[PDB]
């Protein structure tokens with residue numbers, strides 16, 4: 001039982017965090033051109049930036065400690081610091097709550113995302129199994145961002161009060177209970193002692209090319225989402241029906257990307273899904289400067305969400321293959337590098353990177369984050385055969 005059931009646990013533990021981070025979307029409206037939103041965004045920019053820096057600064061401290069504690073207690077902090085955040089939103093009268101309420105969730109996201117991916121890395125040892133399995137587990141992000149806003153928005157308008165958080169606190173304790181049974185995560189058990197120290201993974205070039213590819217893929221969508229024309233007009237008229245829908249294309253395309261390139265990327269060679277993984281991000285972003293209508297953003301969202309899925313699902317199992325080929329196999333830490341790289345685009349990119357566009361115009365910030373991705377694609381020639389220890 002245990003091998004296969006931990007995929008269902010880590011899928012659900014990624015789904016609920018990725019649904020919870022996204023159900024705040026139709027709530028945000030309570031607080032001349034499609035990219036001028038860079039200037040209106042700054043309040044919303046801080047809601048994307050806060051979760052991702054508090055999650056990012058935590059990744060070394062969860063990833064390192066996972067080796068000392070054992071995996072199960074970090075996954076339980078992943079359920080729990082995210083659950084107490086779910087309950088916190090249920091009486092958020094002001095932005096303050098939202099901002100801090102997010103901060104607690106960031107820690108839960110780390111606790112869940114690093115230790116859960118390390119649990120799949122530890123448990124699924126063969127590359128074909130680990131590719132199919134991590135592609136399906138990363139399908140938790142892709143299903144969470146899709147499922148969450150349509151459900152959250154319909155409850156927020158039709159049922160009212162703060163209902164979309166109480167019904168999610170119902171589903172989060174169901175996952176927490178299923179962890180208490182399936183993992184038996186109430187015991188103190190350490191991992192193989194004094195394994196690879198993170199500075200030595202960070203000084204090996206071959207892990208950086210994979211982590212960098214996971215980061216630079218996310219950076220293209222991280223500048224885009226905070227500054228969509230989705231926040232101001234929606235209060236006034238029946239166009240509010242678009243408030244939850246705008247992520248649906250990027251989050252169907254991620255699902256098919258992480259699900260298909262969970263199986264196919266192993267077979268063709270995963271390096272070609274960083275090369276054709278960031279060529280597609282870059283060219284999909286490069287259609288944004290020719291949009292002048294929100295419908296014109298549906299096409300570039302779909303190729304970004306697909307290509308994010310093709311990179312993540314191909315490069316997350318490369319983290320495991322590299323510690324299995326150049327280092328010592330304790331995955332408490334390498335997934336700390338992979339997850340800060342995933343996360344950092346949302347931490348840094350919206351606000352610190354948003355300062356680029358205001359002096360220049362925003363179609364230049366989008367076109368350049370596009371080229372930085374087509375230029376990264378040939379750098380993965382180092383991942384054809386990482387030379388053995």
Ligand SMILES: COc1cc2c(cc1OC)[C@@H]1CC(=O)[C@@H](CC(C)C)CN1CC2
Nearest residue numbers: 021048051141145250251254305308346
């Ligand atoms: C309201 O806040 C947030 C909203 C959203 C995200 C993150 C947020 O906060 C940090 C995720 C993060 C991801 O994983 C990407 C999934 C895509 C490729 C389908 C992009 N966006 C989708 C919406």
